[PDB]
A paper describes a structure:
COPII mediates Endoplasmic Reticulum to Golgi trafficking of thousands of cargoes. ER export is mediated by the coat protein complex II (COPII), which minimally comprises five cytosolic proteins that form two concentric layers on the ER membrane—the inner and outer coat. The inner coat layer consists of the small GTPase Sar1 and the heterodimeric Sec23/24 complex, whilst the outer coat layer comprises the rod-shaped heterotetramer Sec13/31. Here we visualise the complete, membrane-assembled COPII coat by cryo-electron tomography and subtomogram averaging, revealing the full network of interactions within and between coat layers.
Residue numbers in the entry:
A (entry chain B), B (entry chain D): 2 to 157, 170 to 292
C (entry chain C), D (entry chain A): 379 to 469, 495 to 690, 694 to 745
Amino acid sequence: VVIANAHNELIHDAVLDYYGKRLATCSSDKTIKIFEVEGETHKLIDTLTGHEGPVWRVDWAHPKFGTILASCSYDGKVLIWKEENGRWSQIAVHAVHSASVNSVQWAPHEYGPLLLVASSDGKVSVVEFKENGTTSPIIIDAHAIGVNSASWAPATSRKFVTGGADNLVKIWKYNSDAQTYVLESTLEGHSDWVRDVAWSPTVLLRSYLASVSQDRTCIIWTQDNEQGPWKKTLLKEEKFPDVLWRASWSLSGNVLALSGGDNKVTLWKENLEGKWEPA
Amino acid sequence: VVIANAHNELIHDAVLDYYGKRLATCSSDKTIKIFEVEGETHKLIDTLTGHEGPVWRVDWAHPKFGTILASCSYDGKVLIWKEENGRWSQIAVHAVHSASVNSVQWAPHEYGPLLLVASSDGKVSVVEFKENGTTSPIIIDAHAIGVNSASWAPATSRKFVTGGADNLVKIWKYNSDAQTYVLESTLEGHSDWVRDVAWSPTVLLRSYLASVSQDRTCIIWTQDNEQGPWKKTLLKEEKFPDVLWRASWSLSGNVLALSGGDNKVTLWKENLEGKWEPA
Amino acid sequence: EPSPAAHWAFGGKLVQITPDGKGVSITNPKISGLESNTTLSEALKTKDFKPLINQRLVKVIDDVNEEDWNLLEKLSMDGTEEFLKEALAFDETNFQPEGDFSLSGNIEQTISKNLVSGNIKSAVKNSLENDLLMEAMVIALDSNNERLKESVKNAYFAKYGSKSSLSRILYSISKREVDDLVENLDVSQWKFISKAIQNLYPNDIAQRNEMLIKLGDRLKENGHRQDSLTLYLAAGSLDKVASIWLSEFPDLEDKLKKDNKTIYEAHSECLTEFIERFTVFSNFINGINNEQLIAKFLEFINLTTSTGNFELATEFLNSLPSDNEEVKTEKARVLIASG
Amino acid sequence: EPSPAAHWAFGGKLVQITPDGKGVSITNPKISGLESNTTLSEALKTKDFKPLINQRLVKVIDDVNEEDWNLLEKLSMDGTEEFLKEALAFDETNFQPEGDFSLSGNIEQTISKNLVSGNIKSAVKNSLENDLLMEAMVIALDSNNERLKESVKNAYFAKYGSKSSLSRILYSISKREVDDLVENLDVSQWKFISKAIQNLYPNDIAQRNEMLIKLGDRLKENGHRQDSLTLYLAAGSLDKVASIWLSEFPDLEDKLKKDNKTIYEAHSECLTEFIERFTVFSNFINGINNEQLIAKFLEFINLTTSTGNFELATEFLNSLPSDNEEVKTEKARVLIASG
């Protein structure tokens, strides 16, 4: 199934929603597009407008809140969108960062309608939408140089991993006696900017993290339990041909989808040894 | 019970009939008289006439032939009498002897209407009354001097005892190869005329005879069985005061009634010893 | 010549001629030893043989004779019914199962399966075809099925009614019969074969008495004389009692003849005792067609008429079948003689 | 910079950007090891698990597992009813009396008198109050009187049902009960306690099954696993079979994990075998309210949706109580995802 020419400017993100039927894209044209794919057909449904700069990413929210989509852009702001009564409209706007926002992600539906945001300004913001609408977020300084990604850990006590341009990967946990997310662990292992970080939703004892970097390597970080440390495990002994840009875990099977710069997508799974191989 | 003056001339015989209720007498007046005795009363019923001389004896016949009476007299004849329709009449007359007939007696009713007659002419006659009436008798010479009595033996084969004036007693039995009664035994034992002989009707093995005589003694002759002889047994060791004239056996008990000349009647029975004594 | 010219006549009357030679005198001489039977005449009317019985009892002859009069002495007071009474009568659960156990063997297992499988019929078959009769019986003592509830009884007896007297008795009680006991059970336990007749035939008298009789004969013929009479007394068979007594007659007249009595005293006394003994007995039981009895009945008549007691003579004359001529003739004679 | 920007989405779909940088491409990658379950989808519709059963059987794991699939392999051909059949079934008169005899003793005489005197009741009393039980029983096996015809049984058991296993069994067959066998008779003779339930309660199913169950529990808890399932299969208690299988789950997933399989291959393979084993079994018995079962039901749903086989996923979604929200949510999600 292919939807060629969804945009005329280069596209940076395409995400299907909770039912994996409703597509959504974003690119330099500074717009988002909603699609409806079936067998091998497709129908545009709208074009979201507002961002003053190329749009970097989008994330669909859990259906239990409505039909929402979040986006962020080089313009250093985040826009939420809604499809009420049959038409999309900018409900809220989040802009507390002073540089390009590169990632945005809806927390687990159990936490409510929270949003995880990371920016080149080095900070990360956590945002909920009050009873009235406005937003009173959490802002933390999380990386030097710039933050490129941030992902939520599955639900139990709330944790999320960030990936900065300081080559570091970082786990965060919420604390009461601070009313903020505090730095739980710093994981060193990349020699160049970390482009993305994905926390696997696998519900097994062991937790899985996958970080991708400008150094042409993918690292799977794992933690057996609370007393265990985060163990480093290169996805493969040899570096890759080009820069790895994204990492995505399936919802089941704990299968990793790696997006390279040689515009190639490799798939991996774990084996008896604890080492990865092509799935 | 006494019926004084039944006759004016001396009476020689008084016999009650089969029911012992109808009396009958005879005497020198040459007549017989029928009486009916009850408690201590009596009623003459008639006076039989015909005999030309004193009447010696009478004998009632068995009721199964009618109401008959037989008599005999010094006139040497025998007259039978009947009471048909309420009045007595001379039916037949038997006279084959040439001297006083002294006894007459009806045989046992089994033999039929036979009559045993004994006379001073020394003969004895047996008489039946033919189908028509007349009489064709048996006449036998049975004693010298004269015959005074004759009695029939009970029924089984027919026997009778006679008693003559030759002092002898004699048993007679009927014989076929003679068509007459033949002398079976002569019993000697009296020294003077035998006046009467009575054969007891007792139905015991032993037969009893009683002869009475002018010698003032009574002899009981007995015979155990056919092989036995007639054994002599004086009624009592001492002679009697006067002449014994009659002998009569009861019908049961075998009790002997002796009629003496001292006009006295003695009664006797037999005891364990086989000797007689006053009953 | 003058002479009493005495004669005897019916009724024991003596006819003679008065000394005056002109009168006739009829009388009934007193023969010491011969006396009209008053007691009999008076008891036969007042039907109270207490005195008569008390007379024979106090002057009884041999030992046996005493029993009969005693049998009659007590039968006198207590009455027939009440007599036959006193004469025919007589003198762990739980279990709690415990511990393990198991069906050992094919036999047990097969029968057990039958049971549970609601097949109560086969259980018994499998039981009988083994010496598990006790069990076969237990199963059957639970069902209603008669033929099955009986196929076992006939199986018990089949091999036990011969090794146990009580088994053979059950066999009879079971099969509603007495023929077996009545004919083979020891005569000593007669009071029992007696109850088995009154028990099995309580509403069929003809049969009840045919059996009681069949037993009496057996008793009397096996030393139980006194008892066979009791059974007869209850079967209402005067004929059997009569026959026994007529056979016992001779010997009885002999024991009397040895007792210093003339041939007549013996014969006389004997026939009287028998007649009074028979009369009183026939007066309590439920009872003429026996020849000899008749024959001897006639005999007592004559001895009675000779006593002058024409009344007592007629009484016995009546009881005889007016079908017998001798009975006929004497009936007529006694009439005129008395009338 | 240019990049596929790949993502995974429900249904196991992969979204990426074309190299031209202007197109979106959704697909369902082939993950070696993960394959939609056709056999299940096709057998669940054509209700012919011959192939499915033949698959599990030919690739079974441990020995126990093999029995269950075999239990299902044969249950497949013969059918439920016919199966429970082959699984719950199993592998002198006469006597002639002779000669004299006599009532010896007081006991015998008293009982004998009773009998003849038509007093069948007392005979038994006198019998029991002596060790003449055999007889007491014989008399009773002749009357109709139930209370008496029963006063002896309770007398037999009273002292024997404890010294004989067959006696204790009779005691139960007699008194129309099973409680005793079902709870104490050796588990080895279960095929018997089995017949005593179908025998005593042939027209009362609720009770028939309450007892059959009470037994199954006892078997399974005393080494008779395979058999307790047979009893359950006949009591229509899928719940008991489910519970047993859910407890046996862990150890089963462990034997798989030691067999050179990743934590996922094991978990995956296990839940599948259990679900196919439970589905085929629930298809022959007479049978959701068990939490864990539901919980694990939901689990198989997700593994199925991830295969893209939304149809087989809905099928199991239906069978779950539409009372459970997780069941609710997934019901809705699967809908839109497929619709």
